[PDB]
C-alpha cells in the first residue's frame, strides 16, 4: 500500500456512497444510467472471485465486500425500489457492444488461460468502459445535476490515482501489469471532456 492507491480507493468508495445516498434520500434515480450500474456490479462480481482463494488483509476483504454490497444495492434501488423514476427511455446505450467484445478480448489477451484469470481480465477491460452508458445518457438528456457531477468526479479521479500508484510500484517495487495499466489509461481518457467541463463550469457555478 502507498498513499496514491489509498486515496484512489477512498475516492472510489466516496463516489459509490455519494450515488447510493443521493438515490436513497431523494427516493429517485432520475438522470442515472441503470446500465452503467449493472456493468460496475458485473466488474466487482468477476474481479473479486478470489475472495474464495486469497486473503490479502482485513482492509482488502472488507473493501471487496463493501463494493459488491453497494453496487448490488444501487442496482436494486434503480431497477426495483425506485423503478418509477428510472429513465429507461434515455438510458439507451447498447451494452452488448461493450460486453461481447470485452468478453472476447479477455479470453484472447490475458496473463494466463485459466477461468479465474480470464474473469479477472474481463473485469479490468469492462471497468475501462463501464461509465460509457452514463456519459451517453447525460449527452442525450439535459446536462447533469451537481451531485451527479461530484459522483463522476470522484469515480474518474479514482483510476487516475491508480495510474500514479502504478508509477510508484514500478519505481520502488519493480512491479508492473500492462493489462491493468493500458485499461486504466483507457478508463481515465474517457473522463477528459467531463474533467475539463467540471473544472471550468461546475466548480465555477455554471452548467
Amino acid at each position: 500500500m502507498n498513499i496514491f492507491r489509498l486515496t484512489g480507493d477512498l475516492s472510489h468508495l466516496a463516489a459509490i456512497i455519494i450515488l447510493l445516498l443521493k438515490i436513497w434520500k431523494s427516493r429517485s434515480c432520475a438522470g442515472i444510467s441503470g446500465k452503467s450500474q449493472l456493468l460496475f456490479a458485473l466488474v466487482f462480481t468477476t474481479r473479486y472471485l478470489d475472495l474464495f482463494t486469497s486473503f490479502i488483509s482485513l482492509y482488502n476483504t472488507s473493501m471487496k465486500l463493501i463494493y459488491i454490497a453497494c453496487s448490488y444495492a444501487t442496482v436494486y434501488l434503480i431497477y426495483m425500489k425506485f423503478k418509477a423514476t428510472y429513465d429507461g427511455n434515455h438510458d439507451t446505450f447498447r451494452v452488448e457492444f461493450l460486453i461481447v467484445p470485452v468478453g472476447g478480448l479477455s479470453f484472447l489477451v490475458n496473463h494466463d488461460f485459466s477461468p479465474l484469470e480470464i474473469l479477472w481480465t474481463f473485469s479490468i477491460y469492462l471497468e475501462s468502459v463501464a461509465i460509457l452508458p452514463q456519459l451517453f445518457m447525460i449527452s442525450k438528456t439535459g446536462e447533469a445535476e451537481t451531485i451527479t457531477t461530484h459522483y463522476l468526479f470522484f469515480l474518474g479521479l479514482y483510476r487516475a490515482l491508480y495510474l500514479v500508484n502504478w508509477i510508484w510500484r514500478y519505481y520502488f517495487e519493480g512491479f508492473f501489469d500492462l493489462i491493468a495499466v493500458v485499461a486504466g489509461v483507457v478508463q481515465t481518457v474517457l473522463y477528459c471532456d467531463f474533467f475539463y467541463l467540471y473544472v471550468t463550469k461546475v466548480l465555477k457555478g455554471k452548467k
Partner: peptide, 6 residues
C-alpha cells in the same frame, strides 16, 4: 500472481 489491489 496474487492480486493485491482493488
Amino acid at each position: 500472481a496474487e492480486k493485491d489491489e482493488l
